[PDB]
Design an enzyme around this catalytic site. Structure first.
Site, mmCIF file in Angstrom:
data_model
loop_
_atom_site.group_PDB
_atom_site.id
_atom_site.type_symbol
_atom_site.label_atom_id
_atom_site.label_comp_id
_atom_site.label_asym_id
_atom_site.label_seq_id
_atom_site.Cartn_x
_atom_site.Cartn_y
_atom_site.Cartn_z
ATOM 1 N N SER A 189 0.823 -1.202 0.000
ATOM 2 C CA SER A 189 0.000 0.000 0.000
ATOM 3 C C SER A 189 0.861 1.258 0.000
ATOM 4 O O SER A 189 1.770 1.386 0.848
ATOM 5 C CB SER A 189 -0.913 0.041 1.223
ATOM 6 O OG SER A 189 -1.736 1.191 1.220
ATOM 7 N N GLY A 190 0.570 2.176 -0.933
ATOM 8 C CA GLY A 190 1.314 3.430 -1.022
ATOM 9 C C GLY A 190 2.571 3.376 -1.881
ATOM 10 O O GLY A 190 3.298 4.353 -1.992
ATOM 11 N N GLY B 247 -2.749 -2.970 -2.480
ATOM 12 C CA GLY B 247 -1.475 -3.530 -2.106
ATOM 13 C C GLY B 247 -1.382 -4.084 -0.699
ATOM 14 O O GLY B 247 -2.193 -3.790 0.160
ATOM 15 N N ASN C 255 -2.013 5.652 2.973
ATOM 16 C CA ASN C 255 -2.094 6.275 1.648
ATOM 17 C C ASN C 255 -3.313 7.150 1.552
ATOM 18 O O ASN C 255 -4.431 6.693 1.762
ATOM 19 C CB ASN C 255 -2.136 5.163 0.574
ATOM 20 C CG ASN C 255 -2.125 5.720 -0.880
ATOM 21 O OD1 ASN C 255 -2.158 6.935 -1.090
ATOM 22 N ND2 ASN C 255 -2.001 4.815 -1.886
ATOM 23 N N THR D 276 -0.878 2.612 -8.510
ATOM 24 C CA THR D 276 -1.910 3.275 -9.280
ATOM 25 C C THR D 276 -1.317 4.390 -10.166
ATOM 26 O O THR D 276 -1.727 4.544 -11.328
ATOM 27 C CB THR D 276 -2.951 3.811 -8.336
ATOM 28 O OG1 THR D 276 -3.648 2.704 -7.764
ATOM 29 C CG2 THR D 276 -3.951 4.654 -9.096
ATOM 30 N N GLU E 98 -1.007 -4.688 2.954
ATOM 31 C CA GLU E 98 -1.200 -3.663 4.004
ATOM 32 C C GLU E 98 -1.384 -4.279 5.405
ATOM 33 O O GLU E 98 -1.961 -5.354 5.553
ATOM 34 C CB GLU E 98 -2.358 -2.697 3.692
ATOM 35 C CG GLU E 98 -3.762 -3.342 3.723
ATOM 36 C CD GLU E 98 -4.890 -2.342 3.434
ATOM 37 O OE1 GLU E 98 -4.659 -1.298 2.783
ATOM 38 O OE2 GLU E 98 -6.006 -2.540 3.971
ATOM 39 N N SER F 63 -5.537 5.695 -1.303
ATOM 40 C CA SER F 63 -5.537 4.251 -1.320
ATOM 41 C C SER F 63 -6.680 3.691 -2.195
ATOM 42 O O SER F 63 -7.820 4.112 -2.060
ATOM 43 C CB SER F 63 -5.672 3.686 0.114
ATOM 44 O OG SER F 63 -5.392 2.285 0.169
ATOM 45 N N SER F 64 -6.357 2.797 -3.118
ATOM 46 C CA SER F 64 -7.351 2.019 -3.861
ATOM 47 C C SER F 64 -7.956 0.965 -2.962
ATOM 48 O O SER F 64 -7.273 0.068 -2.467
ATOM 49 C CB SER F 64 -6.695 1.272 -5.015
ATOM 50 O OG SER F 64 -6.094 2.209 -5.880
HETATM 51 MG MG LIG Z 1 -3.648 1.903 -5.329
#
Ligand SMILES: [Mg+2]
Ligand SMILES: COC(=O)c1cc2c3c(c(N)cc(N)c3n1)N(C)C2=O
Ligand SMILES: COC(=O)c1cc2c3c(c(N)cc(N)c3n1)N(C)C2=O
Length: 743
Positions: free
Chosen positions: A180-181, A451, A227, A185, A453, A230-231
């Site tokens: 994550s982060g 991602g 993030n 993306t 996390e 974050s997605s």
């Molecule tokens: Mg993402």
């Protein structure tokens, strides 16, 4: 040509700066150096020490503080000659070890070079600041260049995938890994930009493809503590091409939206951006028509303590999101319905159930219920009965329940989550209808998952995410190490198989095995068992895996958690609510309520079977775990039919700060990603290989006469290459192919 003009932006922003004469002096030095740990308990904090003497088995070196130390040569991490510092392809390093790899990345990152090759795949270190390397001029620079002609860049791997698609007439994939982060993306979006540019053509499709993202991000991304963008859903974007190599379309498969976030957000986190975008950006009487106030007035926005992200104007973002909806083609009425649904969700969240005269809940204040019903276009009395007194079957009898406060709140939340997820699904589907107008010849698929996390409290969502990330690392492992060597061994090139020591299979099997059942299978079983609880579930997991599976831990410090050892580290998971999350229930009377909606989008959310219907397995609906797993296996099956290209995004620190490359954070990522092993397989093995007959037509000869044809293939290749008198250490002879180490 700016690649050759040292004043160009290309040279300034993608190439390593020219060293000075003092640097030259250092560079031709005979001195030798070692990377060592000043504190042996901190194995990731290194300094450079000069080697001052050696024995047959040891080096003695000066530390920065002048003290001498001694190390076995077998334990020594020698520093590469400094001419390698900043090298674009780390397979070129003389010494391939951890501090040397990190140092090369550090030298590049300090000069804002975030991209570095490590053989065949790209490493990307998040800068956490804007660097001007994504303009159209940069794009144009990469178009048509062989990989080795230009600096490492996401555009370059993108171009490589594109040309591979053309030259081999084979589908490609771009697999972007990272926690994550890490930058997944942003890089995904750069890939799409590059492809849309180089394969682009009427010309509005490319714009629409690109304009899908603010929509998806507004609804599908949120601030977490890791993030700010974050997605909270994974996606696979198929960029589609005709036989000629032009873009003919695109299709997005989305995965696993974190619907729980709609109703709950941790301290300092946000709900999805769209909520804040609406409340901040809506017109004066948009807000009157939808009964909206500020975020502090809504339970689903006022619990985390955070309504803002530094550097982001939610109002401005709202304007960008609506503009995207304009380009993609959502009508004004459609958009209005979308915002009615978002607003309705906030109102649902404001409903406050209270204990009635008995155990059953009541609604004393109907302001929020009435406002939701009004914007959704449903009957509020029907909604109320459906929330607190839903009807179910008992055998064949029809029985009104009377839910207590807690069950009522849960049902309202279930309704909210169902609304948000169906709406998300609908947005994606609507998008696909616009980008998919023609049957493809080819595709390049770009994967942008949520991602790896880890939080203080990890739940079922974390398990699914981390599972997906483990499957993706395994895919890298399979292609880089397992299949590569299988080719070597089938082509009998005299290879002794190497155990690179990277295998996620045990962890994967633990999560998703069938016989014996893995975690998800026991979860499913508990999920259709009438007497089951979060407690019978955790007990059941410990019973199957504790002291049995090497990747599982029953902790002594807790009765509701279990540990899974991932590639990226151990994670402890809290079992609370797993049965309910997996079953993902919604009272049928709530569906019936909303099926009767006067709104054209809402009714689609509840009557369109692709959106509203749920598959069965036997007498039970499919669980979330079994469906996601079906979906993931499907994705992996598709990837396996493609030629993969890997981009490994690396997060520099855990603070979202620029100019702060942290040793332990990065080295942990390099280690579990398998970076050094990958570089090593590129060097020790034979990266390039060609069938004994398709060679004739790139060049001609230099030989005693083997033309574009011949009767021979083996010696007919031997002869031709031989004249350059290039070393036969740099090649081998397979049953059908010539192999090579470095072209
Ligand atoms: Mg993402
Ligand atoms: C991603 O979200 C959705 O697609 C979604 C979400 C939900 C959902 C249900 C269903 N009973 C059926 C669906 N077909 C469905 N789809 N519930 C209870 C949900 O929360
Ligand atoms: C995919 O292969 C399997 O089904 C499989 C195989 C095995 C397995 C275990 C477990 N402790 C847990 C699993 N979930 C599991 N799954 N052991 C010891 C196995 O040999």
């Amino acid at each position: 040509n700016p690649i050759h003009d040292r004043t160009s932006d290309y040279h300034k922003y993608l190439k390593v700066k020219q060293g000075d004469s003092d640097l030259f002096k250092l560079t031709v030095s005979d001195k030798r150096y070692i990377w060592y740990n000043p504190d042996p308990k901190e194995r990731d904090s290194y300094e450079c020490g000069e080697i001052v003497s050696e024995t047959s088995d040891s080096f003695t070196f000066k530390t920065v503080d002048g003290q001498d130390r001694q190390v076995k040569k077998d334990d020594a991490n020698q520093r590469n000659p400094i001419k390698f510092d900043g090298v674009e392809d780390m397979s070129e390093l003389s010494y391939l070890n951890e501090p040397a790899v990190f140092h090369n990345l550090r030298v590049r990152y300090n000069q804002d070079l975030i991209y570095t090759y490590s053989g065949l795949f790209l490493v990307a270190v998040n800068p956490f600041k804007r660097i001007p390397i994504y303009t159209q001029e940069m794009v144009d620079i990469f178009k048509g260049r062989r990989r080795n002609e230009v600096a490492p860049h996401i555009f370059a791997i993108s171009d490589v995938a594109y040309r591979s698609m053309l030259d081999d007439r084979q589908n490609q994939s771009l697999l972007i890994t990272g926690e994550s982060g890490a930058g997944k993306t942003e890089n995904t979006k750069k890939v799409i930009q590059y492809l849309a540019s180089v394969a682009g053509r009427s010309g509005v499709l490319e714009q629409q493809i690109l304009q899908a993202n603010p929509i998806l991000e507004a609804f599908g991304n949120a601030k977490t503590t890791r993030n700010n963008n974050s997605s909270r859903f994974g996606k696979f974007i198929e960029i589609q091409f005709n036989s000629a190599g032009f873009i003919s379309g695109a299709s997005i498969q989305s995965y696993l939206l974190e619907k729980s976030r709609v109703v709950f957000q941790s301290e300092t986190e946000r709900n999805y951006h769209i909520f804040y975008q609406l409340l901040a950006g809506a017109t004066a009487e948009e807000k009157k028509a939808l009964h909206l106030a500020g975020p502090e007035s809504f339970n689903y926005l006022n619990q985390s303590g955070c309504v803002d992200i530094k550097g982001v104007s939610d109002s401005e973002e709202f304007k960008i999101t609506r503009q995207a909806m304009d380009i993609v083609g959502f009508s004004q009425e459609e958009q209005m319905s979308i915002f009615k649904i978002i607003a309705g969700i906030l109102h649902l969240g404001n409903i406050k159930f209270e204990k009635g005269a008995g155990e059953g809940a009541v609604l004393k204040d109907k302001t929020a219920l009435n406002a939701a019903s009004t914007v959704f276009g449903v009957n509020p009395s029907v909604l109320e009965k459906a929330l607190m007194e839903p009807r179910i079957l008992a055998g064949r009898d029809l029985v009104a329940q009377h839910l207590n406060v807690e069950k009522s709140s849960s049902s309202r939340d279930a309704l909210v989550k169902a609304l948000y997820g169906r709406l998300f699904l609908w947005l994606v589907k609507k998008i696909n209808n616009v980008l998919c107008q023609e049957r493809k010849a080819y595709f390049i698929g770009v994967l942008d998952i949520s991602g790896f996390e880890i939080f203080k409290v990890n739940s079922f969502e974390q398990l699914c995410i981390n599972y997906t990330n483990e499957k993706l690392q395994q895919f890298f492992n399979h292609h880089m190490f397992k299949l590569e060597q299988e080719e070597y061994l089938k082509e009998k090139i005299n290879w002794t198989f190497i155990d690179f020591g990277l295998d996620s299979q045990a962890t994967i099997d633990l999560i998703d095995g069938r016989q014996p059942p893995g975690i998800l299978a026991l979860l499913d079983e508990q999920s259709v068992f009438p007497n089951a609880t979060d407690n019978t579930l955790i007990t059941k997991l410990h019973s199957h895996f504790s002291k049995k599976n090497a990747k599982y831990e029953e902790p002594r410090f807790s009765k509701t958690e279990f540990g899974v050892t991932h590639y990226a580290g151990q994670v402890m998971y809290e079992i609370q609510d797993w049965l309910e999350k997996n079953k993902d229930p919604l009272q049928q009377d709530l569906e019936l309520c909303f099926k009767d909606s006067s709104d054209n989008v809402v009714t689609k959310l509840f009557n369109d079977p692709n959106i509203a219907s749920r598959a069965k397995k036997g007498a039970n609906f499919i669980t979330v775990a079994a469906q996601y797993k079906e979906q993931l296996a499907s994705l992996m099956a598709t990837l396996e039919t493609t030629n993969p290209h890997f981009v490994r995004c690396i997060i520099p620190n855990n603070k979202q700060l620029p100019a702060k490359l942290e040793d332990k954070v990065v080295l942990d990522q390099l280690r579990c990603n398998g970076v050094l092993e990958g570089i090593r397989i590129t060097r020790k093995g034979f990266p390039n290989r060609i069938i004994y007959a398709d060679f004739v037509k790139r060049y001609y000869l230099l030989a005693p006469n083997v033309p574009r044809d011949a009767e021979d293939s083996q010696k007919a290749t031997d002869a031709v290459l031989k004249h350059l008198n290039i070393d036969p250490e740099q090649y081998r002879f397979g049953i059908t192919k010539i192999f090579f180490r470095a072209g």
